[PDB]
């Protein structure tokens, strides 16, 4: 796979916790992009073998996370994961 390849990954919203920390955001000069910082046990992401820490988040449920602030990214993913009617969650990512 080439650096930064795009990949669409689906994730069920059944678990109460997404179980991920995210890092970065357009205010950051060091990490302008939003990346998965850590995947935590107990959550939904720990169960997806295609999700890894270090992936760049591009979109969630059709909502762009490109060039967004950290605050908007957190808010956008939270709203998507709590929207249980839309199942599964769709995450567009760029792999390292």
């Amino acid at each position: 796979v080439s650096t930064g390849a795009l990949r669409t990954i689906t994730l069920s919203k059944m678990k109460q916790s997404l179980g991920i920390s995210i890092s970065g955001g357009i205010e950051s000069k060091v990490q302008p992009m939003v990346k998965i910082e850590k995947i935590f046990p107990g959550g939904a992401a720990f169960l997806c073998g295609d999700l890894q820490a270090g992936f760049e988040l591009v979109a969630v449920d059709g909502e762009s996370l490109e060039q967004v602030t950290h605050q908007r990214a957190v808010d956008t993913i939270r709203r998507a994961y709590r929207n249980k009617a839309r199942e599964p969650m769709e995450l567009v990512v760029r792999v390292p």
Binding site: I20, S21, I22, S23, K29, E37, H70
Partner: peptide, 7 residues
């Protein structure tokens, strides 16, 4: 300046 938040 990298922010990290548990989602």
């Amino acid at each position: 300046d990298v922010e990290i938040t548990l989602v």
